[PDB]
Each structure stands twice: as C-alpha cells, then as structure tokens.
Nucleic acid binder design. Structure first.
Lengths: 73, 161, 119, 121, 154
RNA sequence: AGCACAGUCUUAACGAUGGAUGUCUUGGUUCCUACAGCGAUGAAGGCCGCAGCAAAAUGCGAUACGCAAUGAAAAUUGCAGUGACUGAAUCAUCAGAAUGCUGAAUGUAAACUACACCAAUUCCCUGGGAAUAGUGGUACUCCUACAGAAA
RNA sequence: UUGUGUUGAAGCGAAAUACGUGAGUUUUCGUGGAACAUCUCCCUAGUGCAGAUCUUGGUGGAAGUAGCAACUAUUCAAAUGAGAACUUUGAAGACUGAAGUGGAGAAGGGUUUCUUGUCAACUGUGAUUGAACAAGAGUUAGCCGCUCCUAAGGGAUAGCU
RNA sequence: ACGGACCAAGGAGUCUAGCAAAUGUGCAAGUGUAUAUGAUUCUUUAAACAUUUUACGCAUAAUUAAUG
RNA sequence: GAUGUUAGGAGGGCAAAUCCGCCGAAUUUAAGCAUAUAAUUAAGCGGAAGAAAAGAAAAUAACUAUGAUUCCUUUAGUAACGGCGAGUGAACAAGGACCAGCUCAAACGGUUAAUCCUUCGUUUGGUGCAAACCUUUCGACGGAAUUGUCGUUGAAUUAUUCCAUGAAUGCCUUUAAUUUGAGCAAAGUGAGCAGGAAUGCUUCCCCAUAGAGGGUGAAAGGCCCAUAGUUCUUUUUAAUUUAUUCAUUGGAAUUUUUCAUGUCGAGUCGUGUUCUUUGAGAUUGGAGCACUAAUACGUGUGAUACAUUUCACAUAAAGCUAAAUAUAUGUAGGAGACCGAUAGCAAACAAGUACCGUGAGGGAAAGAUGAAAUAGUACUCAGGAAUGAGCAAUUAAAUAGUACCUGAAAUCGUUAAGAUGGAACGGAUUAAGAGAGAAAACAAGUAAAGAGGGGAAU
C-alpha cells in the first residue's frame, strides 16, 4: 500500500505537491469546524444548509424500543 | 473544512493514545476459556457444568414475541415442580427470588421444563452404594447398575438450551 | 584439610579447640605472608575453608541443641519460629478461613452440592 | 520441534552453548564411539574422558590416533598425546581438536562410566 | 513497534536565538559528548523515527466468507487441471492424471520410507528430488530472525 | 655516470589518513503466556569489607569470588596450589548454618565510629571450669490481659 | 518459483568496441573471504537527498601562519646522560627585601608527602626534570584540637490545624 | 537578497479513527456471521475451518417540533 | 481515665503496570477570548491485591415483561448538554462471557450466657531421616460479656424422608487425565575433485513418528548436543475397589392442627441555599450550611417545576462475597513479514557507567585478528631506544600484527603523462596523443595427422 502512495511520485519535486507559494502550513484556516458563520460560511451554507440553530422540542430519555416498528408494503 | 464532505465529528480531542487497545489474544483467550470449561467438566466428572435456566419472555414491545433463558426459576415454579429452592440449587437448577409468574402460561411452561429436567436426572449416591430417596424434591438416588449403565451414555445438553 | 562428616561426631570441645588451633595456624601463615616469606601462601585458602567447615559443624550442632531445648513449649524465640513471609505470618489460619457458623454448617451438611447425571 | 516449551531460537540456544556451565559442557563435549566398542556397549556416543583412546577423522590430522591428554571445556577442545605443534618462539603445544571430529576407540573404565553404560543398556 | 518514548527521553531545549547554530533542540549540561548535541527529531542521531511504528496498525484483514469460499473452490478447480499444476512448478510429467486420487490405505501407511516410495511409484521422483535439493539458506538477514532455510512446496 | 626549472592544476597507478559499505550479532524491541508483595523474624536503598598474588564488574559477609547438604561428577589452572583411582576438583541445585555498619531505623545523637541507663555477659564439662568492657534490652502510636495508686 | 557461491558471495576501486533516452542494468580486471539473488508472479515498508545557520563523525584552505611579550638577568666550568639554555654541583652577577614565592595555620584539595625507579603520553621550546608514570613506605597525644557548655539559631515532644 | 568550506552516514505527507468519491471483487432486497461458541487443528496454528430452519449495523420509505 | 522497659501482639518503610480514595492545573481548541474545551487529565497526597473496585435492587420497564455485580458486541456519536458555537455525550432493552449467594441490626430463647478469649495440662491418630506439620477432645485457671456474646429466623403439633453421631470387623486394588524432574532415542565420518580445513561439487549408500535449532576448520537428516517418539518419577483429580454389624444423641426439609401480623438501620432521608460535578436539562451525584421527617396504608424511584389522585416497581440511611475483567511493574518462558552498532532501550562493552552541576538533576562514547594464539611474531643485522630491514619466521593469508574483517569519500604522499599571460570547470564539434579491445569489424567448408569427447549400431 505504501508503494502506491501519491507522495512517492513527488519524491524529488521540492514542494511535495503542496505549492511553492501557499506552502503546506498547519491549520491555516482553523481546526475542525472552526470558521462556520465567519470564514467557512460559504462552505457551510453551500453543502450543509440547515446546520446552525435548533428546531423542535426535546424528548428527554427516548427508549427507542417503545416506538420501534418496522414496516412492510 | 473544504468541499462537500460530512461535517467532521471525531472525538479524539483528549489523550487517546493511552486508551487505544488491540485484542491480539482474541482466539488465544477463546482457547483458554475452552480449556478451562473442559477441565472443570472433567473435574466434576459426568455431571454437566451447565445449570438449568427458565424460559422467559424478553421485555418491551420490541422483543415481545421472543423468549430466552432467564436467571432462576421462581418459587412458584419450583413448588409446582415439587422442590424447594435450597434443594433445587444443589442439583444444577437456578433459582431467583425476584421474578414472579404474572401469567399461567409462563408458570406452566417453566414447571413442565423443570419436570422434564427432574425426570431426566439420575442421582449419584452421597455415600457410595448407600442410596437414599432424597429430600426437598430431589429425586431418589439411583443404584449401582443404572448409574454404571448411564455413565457411558451421551448426556443430553439440549435440555439446557 | 578436613571434611565436615568426620568431625560431625566430635564434641563441642574437639570442635572449638580444633578451631582454635586452626585459627592459630592461619595467623602464623598470615604472619609469614606479612614477612617476605611466600612459600606457604597458598595454604591460606585451605586453612580458611577448614575454619569455615568447623564453624559450620559447630553452629549447626548448637542450633540443633537450642531447638531441642525449645521443643514444643509454644513460646519459642523469634529466630526459632517460622520465618515465613510477614504477610503469610499475618494471614488467617486455614481453619479460621474455613470456619463457619452452626447455621451455615447445618445448612451445608443437610443440602450439599451433589453429583448426578442428565440423561 | 513440536514441543513449544523449549525454544528453537538461534540467539537463545547459541547463547546457551557459549555460556553453558561446565556441567553442560561435559555433555556437549561427547564424541562418537567406534563400531567395535559401540557393539560391545550398545550405545552410540559418550562424553570424552582424559584417558580415552581417540582416532581423529576430520581436519588436518584425520588419521592420527592417541590417548587424549587433557580436556579443556572453556575452549571446547581435547588434546591427544602426539598431535602437538611448534609455536613461533619454538616451544611445543598440543593442537586442540573438537570432540565432534574424533571417534573413541578405547575407553578407560570407572565405577561411574560403568553405571552410565549400564543405564545405556 | 518501537519503544513508545524512544528518542524523546531527554531534556528539551532549543536555545537557538543567536547561538549561530541550527534551532534544533539540544541536550543540556556539560562534561560529556552528549551535552549540546541535537536532541529528538527524525534528522538527529538518537532522535526518534519520523512516525514511530505503533501496535495499532491494521495488522489483519476481515475477508468476506463468500469470497474465501470462492477462493478455496477455485483453488481446487485449478489443482484439477494439468497445465496449471505444471505451470506452478511441480514436475508432474510422469503421473497419469492430475486430479490424482489414491486408495484409502494412503491414510493407513505410517512410515516415511514407504511414503516416499509411494510418491516415487506414482511418478513423482523428479518432484521429490526438486523438494530435497531446494533446501538452502536464504539471502538477507531473515536468517538472523529464525528464518534460516527456504524450501520449495511439494 | 648523466638528464629533468620551480610552483599551480588535471588524469592514472600505488600508498597514507579516515572509518563508510558489505557481511556478522550471547543485544534491543514488540506481542503472547504464567505467576507475583517485601519489611521490626529489620525490607528496598546506601556504605564498609572479603581472594595467595585482586583495580572494576560480578559474587559473597568476619564461615566473606564462598561453608554445609543434594544431583552430576574429574578436573581446576596466568603462576602458586588443590584434587578419586568419590561428602574431596569443578559444575548445578540450594531447604541447613551464617548473614559487618546502616537504613522505616526504633535508647540519645550525628560532616561525632560521640554519650546514656538496665541486666554483667559468653563459652565448656556434667553442680563445677574458664574467658571476657564483650553481649542483650530500652522509640512513638495502638490493641488485649494484668498491676498498683486516684473520687 | 528457479537459481549463483572456496575453481571465491556480498561489498569496494578502476573500467567497458556493452545495453538503455534516462533513472539505471549488465559485464571485465583488481581487491575481498562468506554469503547472495530471483525481472515468474505477488506482498510489504522506517524505500531513493545537494541544500534545512540540518544531525553525528571525519577532513580541509587559512598556515608552518597568528602566535609562544606581566613578574629588571643572566654567565663560566664540571657531573649525569644517546642527547642538557630551562637536571645536579662549584664559581660569579643579581632578585625577593620581613607588607617576602620566608615560617606556621583555616577553608578547599586528598597522597600531591617520602625513598627508589623512571619517560609512552603530559610537563604548549627542550627535558635526563616533575605535583607525570611505576613499586614500596610514611601520619604515634591523659596535657594540641574535636569531644563538653551555651549563642544567633535548627530539629523534635504536647497539643492544635 | 538569504543558506551552502569539504566528504560520508542519517534526514521529512506517515499511522490510526471516521466520511465520501473512484475503481476492482463477492453476493444481491438483501448484505456483513459481531461478541461468542465447536472441533481427533493445537511447531507453523495469534491462522485456517464451522455456525440445530427473528442478535446487531447498514439497506429495504418518506415526512413532521410533535400526538403521528 | 492516667501510669508501667508488666505479658502477648500490631502499625511505620520500599515497590506501582493494572487497582482504590483525595487534591488538582495550564498549555491546547474555539482560527481572538472570558463560559466551554483541554480534563473530572498531568503534577501533588494517601491506601490495597494477585487482581482491586463493584455487587445481591429504596433496579429496570410499561412488555406476553425482565431480575446482584463485572466485562465484551451493540444500543450510539444516539437521547441529551453547549457563547446551541467549538465541542461534549450517557442509559434501558437485545446477543454473549461468567454465574452464587449470604449475615448483622431488629423479632424470639431467663427452671438460669445456652457465649468468647488467655494460660496451663492429658491423649486421637497420621505422613518427615530429621527439622517440623496436620488432626485431636477431656478439662482446669484467669478474665471478658447482661451498657448483650451465642442459638433461632415466628412458635408449638402430627406425618413421612433426609443429615451429622461412636465401637468392632474387613478394604486401601485398577485405569484415565494432569503436572515436575529425569533417562533412552534412526541413519556415512564411503569412494574421487579441490581446499589449510567439508558440512561444498560429483558418485555410491541409508534413516525419517527425527528434514526444529545450535555446535563442528566452508552449506550436515546420517560427526556432537538436541529433535520425533517413548519409559520411569513428582503434584492433584476424576472414575472404578467394600462395606457389615450393635447403640443413642442431635439436627434438617416438606407436609397436617393451632396462634399474630411482628421486625425492617435518624441529625438519617428529604427540602432550601451555596459550590462543584454530570448528557441530566425550573439541577445527575457529591459536599458545606440551615431546617429536619414518616413508620410499611410508610417512603423512594417512574429523566419538566406544581396541586389532588390512580397505577407499577423497589424496600435507603449496616456488612461480606468467587468467576468472567485490567495489567507501559517485577520475574520466568515462547515467539515475530521488527532493528542490525549514527539502527535497536540511554546502555550488544566494566551503562545509568565515565564525566558535568552546590543541588534538584544531566548523562555519553565505545562490538568484529585468525579455524586455531594450546599458531600473537622466534633468529640475525642496524640502532641509546622506539623502530626498521632481512638470505630469517607463524599462518591458507601478516597489505589478517593486537588503532588487527572488508576498508568508500573528503584530505594528503610517490611515480608518470599533460596543461599553465588577472580563476577553474563546462556545452557543442573535430583533431592530436595515450590506454585498452575483436562479441559484426574476412574466409564456411575441403583433404591429411594428433589429442580427445558423445550418439546409434551386437
């Protein structure tokens, strides 16, 4: 598996495919889901529309066995 | 994040390298458990290591229809079978003091199961050819000839299932 | 050069004065070695081991008599009583560990776990 | 091979060989028996002894015979009476032969050698 | 896996603002060669490998039961055809048929001599010769890892 | 018997310096398995010693690189030396004996081999006969039993 | 899977009417002295270096160069020795100048002390010298000190936290 | 403009979790036999082999805060 | 109470990987940061075992219901928490491993503490060579305890049936398993080549329930240890051997006839408030403080704060408990698609060593002659000596000479060839020299004689 890796085919290419200009730094945009609503907001709204906020009422302890029912047509 | 991916969710924000463990010994432990139960059935020598458990209905509407092995027969079930809990616990019959028979169907099904086990039992004398007729509902002691002729017959483990 | 078994039969005298003369000749050997004379230096090993053997036999005799002196008596000194591990010494005895009340005993005698066969 | 209690590890058993105590060395240093006394003692091998008769069948001296003169277990070697060689300074010294390269042709007998041969019969 | 903390068991100090030396961490103190030497870091002598091997590598693989059974069935089918057995390396030019079956007393035979004799009588003397003279000590340092010999498969 | 200018640089052969490479490995590492507490009956740790010639490491404790006993059993050696013709040389085992000063350290102390108090003490013969200033004991807290004072 | 090795493997040095476009591959001679491939197909990774004031080790030009400059100062003759400006002896010229490179101690050091050897290294020149190296030896207390007393103060007991 | 006196050896997109896409493979309204059990296999084997005719995941149905 | 160097005892310290209490950060993430996260983590303090801890419901559920604890698969990245941001995050059911239940308190026993401990004794039989150990029941003595030990588990009454009781006589077999330590254990040291030396190459034989490994002068199934196998021996542990007589002493289970519904853990639960903790949200647990209960018809849970009330479940405030589980520690075994001396542990070696720091601490470098030094360099010459040289010498080999296998590059020396007016090197094209070279770079066949090798032909 390790001899099929794409980094192997950039072995003598200096930048390792990560750009001579932008470089490969560590977390240049933030960690995890950091920038939602601020600088990742386009990504969040374009791919995960209803992500932020809450809707509905709470069900405190669920006990899924109570409402479990499989269906057949 | 970038592109159309699921929003990440990984709970690895603590020192997890200390808590990761790998089971290299899964089948080795399989063999060890097998050997242990083999040795503890050879040690008691003929009497099964399995104990009789009742048939009970799984709770909740999810598993309403399914039955499984409970722990311990009830006092009513044991009394219907004709034996006391203290006596029953000496012949491989589990007893639990918590369960109650809410329905005659469960009561009679577990009583019939207990009776089948009792009728399948053959009892070894406590004092080596001093056979007696037992107490607390324990069946009477079998004698030398039937014990010798049953000790070489395959014990039915299907009763415990 | 003496062996342990022949002098095992000696009295404590024949043991102690033989040790005394052995020590004396070892001291003479050491004095000779202190001087330039080194012709007999290799005998020091043998004399030292003889001293060890004599002391071994004497001390084993003394320990045996001191054990006979406290035979039974239930109050032997600490060096005589058992040198088990401290935790083993403080452990409850097997009888204490297995001791059961009358109620439990008369339950277990009347309803013991018993052998049986399932057909 | 089939016994897992004992190891077949190369480093483990050559450490055992090169750090064997003298007691194990005296059994490592066994040799073959000639056909004659092999027939007479119904055994195949015996540890070499200080007065045994030896016919070396391997090495530069593969025809010489002689009673062994000394057994040195530190270097795993035996020496036979007339297989000496000349040192640079000019004194004589025995050539060490590994016991695997010799075959016993005659054995000195002893109370203990008798009991070993009896245990072998 | 390498030892968990290997290469990192020293005191970390990279006193590197104006020393005219590279900013790599250096071991402290004095009085020994180690003092002031480049500390942990994949480029430093005694520093620790880049991604230390861990025991939670994916050692095994779960294989579909149906795929495993398929593989076994196909291997049996392949063993049944002569050109494949010839191409794998067995010297079978002299046995009568390749799905070769013998009577049940092969199970009762018990001596290696008569087993080898049965193999020869079936026409497999060349195969046995290949097996016995394939024994030889392998190349590389696998032989300092209890992997001394390398045999052919009969 | 004579002849090359010198230096600088290039190439080849042979060397020097250096310790790469290859090959080794009584080491490490990882997994699996099993067992699992030692200590006032003085532990772990620390000092100090101990060999014929002996620094370290290893081993051992005034019996001091080892005693006894048990199994094997002829070597052990650098020299000197010691060994049966097998409780003897050397291995292994290791149950007996022995185990310095310390250290929780516990009579008081401590950059003291300093200073107490109480029993004198130890050995040998089968009540005597010797030799020793040596040997034991003495912490704090607590439990059980006892003792004699008290309100 | 199918091969090469003591009639010399790996490695290494120089090479080749050699192949490739190229990473390379393959051969020769030398050296070497015990292992080595597999391109049949596949599996696997701690897998490819010119740099990172990279890490460790080794080695250069600088260069026989900078330098070997405080403390006024040396000389003659002899001895020893393979060898003497810097070892010893005699003679001379001088210095330190009792606020001393003079005698006794403390702290610190720990055998540097002494005698006899003695020169591989060290003694930044030499060295036969030495505080170096080697073998032995040397420290004697009722009166000198410690030990005792108490001080600034420290530790602990009773409590109490 | 900065780094590089020289040479050797070492030296940097990897490992695990989780998701997706792509492609290969098996089976297909199913699919994966999880933990575990068995079994004349117990050098290898810590792997292979097996599973008395409603375990669980995902899928087979969506939608609503929700009774549904 | 105080005091006792009265008698007998215990605690203290080390070690920690797993385990149990406490105390308790910040870096970090949030692209800033303060709640949050890191984390109920690190560090700090204390305490145990071969496991610990948890544990026999004041539990779930809402079902046709389950039934102590722990662990695995799953539930489930789910319900929920959260500047509802980053992030965090359980439980029940289901399938498995393992499987075990119990005792105090309280009730009852006063025609009699029926309990317990100390010390001193007697014999009851056993395996040890001994040392020691296991059994043993008849006391006596001195105490403790009514400010409560022990028995019962409501208590009497029939019936059956079980269980412990002593003495005498006889029997102590036989096998399977399991676990230590020991023995025994196949077949070539056959030609020939070469080599210092086969274990190599040819060739002729074999053994294999042994072709695992190691050693041996080079690669060994047949040279050695050992390996396969097998035989004894140790541990315990099942089944199978035999039990029979004579007797009274107590106990137990269930079933008949009676009486009374008993007991059931208090500064505790609970509530309020504060802080923390939790997924727990008009508060999950814990803790401090204030207030402070009921008595089983009670009181606690039923995940939203209340009032009135049904229903279900459990029976808090005392205690013990094996297994399944974990083990970066120690010790001992065994392994590997691991590393191969700048790697692998820091340490392959006299390594936590040398050495450094007042100290807490910091912490290296360093493996390889050769088959054999039981071959480690003899002799001569020259030198003060170190060394050097040899007509001398060990070795297969000394250019393997102790910094010793191989022995790269940088850097330097010797010899030779060439170039040489303020760089050197280079690209491209040839030329002149100098090294090597015939595998395409001519000659197949034909006739003869000389050495050989093969194939077929009796």
């Amino acid at each position: 598996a390790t001899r099929f890796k794409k980094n192997r085919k950039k072995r003598g290419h200096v930048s390792a495919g990560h750009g001579r200009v932008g470089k490969h730094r560590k977390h240049p945009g933030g960690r995890g889901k950091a920038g939602g609503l601020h600088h990742m907001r386009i990504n969040f709204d374009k791919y995960h529309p209803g992500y932020f906020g809450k809707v509905g009422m709470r069900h405190l302890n669920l006990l899924k066995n109570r409402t479990y029912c499989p269906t057949i047509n | 994040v970038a592109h159309n991916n699921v929003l990440p969710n990984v709970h690895l924000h603590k020192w997890w390298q200390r808590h990761v463990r790998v089971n290299f010994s899964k089948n080795i432990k399989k063999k060890k458990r097998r050997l242990l139960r083999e040795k503890r059935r050879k040690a008691n020598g003929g009497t099964p290591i399995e104990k009789l458990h009742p048939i009970v209905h799984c709770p909740t509407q999810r598993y309403n229809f399914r039955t499984r092995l409970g722990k311990g027969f009830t006092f009513e079930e044991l009394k219907g079978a004709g034996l006391t809990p203290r006596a029953a616990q000496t012949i491989g019959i589990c007893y639990d003091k918590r369960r109650k028979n809410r329905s005659e169907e469960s009561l009679t099904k577990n009583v019939e199961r207990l009776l089948k086990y009792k009728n399948s039992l053959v009892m070894i004398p406590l004092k080596k050819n001093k056979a007696k007729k037992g107490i607390g509902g324990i069946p009477a002691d079998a004698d030398k000839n039937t014990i010798k002729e049953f000790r070489n017959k395959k014990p039915l483990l299907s009763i415990f299932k | 050069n003496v062996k342990a078994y022949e002098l095992r039969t000696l009295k404590k005298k024949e043991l102690l004065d033989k040790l005394d003369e052995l020590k004396k000749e070892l001291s003479g050997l050491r004095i000779s070695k202190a001087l330039g004379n080194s012709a007999k230096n290799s005998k020091i090993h043998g004399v030292r081991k003889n001293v060890a053997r004599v002391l071994t036999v004497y001390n084993q005799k003394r320990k045996m008599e001191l054990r006979q002196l406290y035979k039974n008596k239930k109050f032997k000194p600490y060096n005589l009583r058992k040198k088990l591990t401290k935790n083993k010494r403080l452990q409850l005895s097997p009888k204490q560990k297995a001791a059961m009340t009358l109620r439990q005993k008369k339950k277990v005698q009347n309803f013991p776990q018993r052998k049986y066969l399932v057909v | 091979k089939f016994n897992k209690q004992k190891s077949s590890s190369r480093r483990k058993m050559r450490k055992a060989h090169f750090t064997a105590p003298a007691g194990l060395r005296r059994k490592i240093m066994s040799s073959k028996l000639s056909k004659e006394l092999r027939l007479k003692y119904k055994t195949r091998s015996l540890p070499v002894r200080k007065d045994d008769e030896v016919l070396i069948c391997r090495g530069h001296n593969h025809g010489r015979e002689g009673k062994v003169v000394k057994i040195n277990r530190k270097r795993y070697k035996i020496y036979v009476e007339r297989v000496t060689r000349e040192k640079v300074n000019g004194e004589s010294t025995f050539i060490g032969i590994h016991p695997s390269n010799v075959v016993l042709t005659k054995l000195k007998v002893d109370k203990n050698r008798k009991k070993i041969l009896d245990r072998k019969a | 896996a390498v030892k968990l903390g290997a290469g990192y068991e020293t005191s970390a100090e990279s006193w590197g603002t104006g020393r005219a030396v590279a900013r790599i961490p250096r071991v402290p103190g004095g009085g020994t060669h180690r003092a002031g030497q480049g500390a942990f870091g994949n480029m430093c002598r005694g520093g620790g490998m880049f991604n230390p091997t861990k025991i939670w590598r994916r050692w095994g693989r779960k294989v579909n039961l149906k795929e495993k059974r398929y593989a076994v069935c196909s291997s049996i089918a392949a063993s049944g055809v002569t050109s494949l057995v010839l191409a794998r390396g067995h010297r079978i030019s002299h046995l009568k048929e390749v799905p070769l079956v013998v009577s049940n007393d092969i199970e009762s035979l018990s001596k290696t001599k008569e087993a080898v004799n049965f193999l020869v009588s079936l026409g497999l003397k060349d195969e046995v010769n290949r097996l016995v003279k394939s024994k030889k000590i392998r190349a590389g340092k696998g032989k300092m890892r209890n992997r001394k010999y390398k045999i052919r498969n009969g």
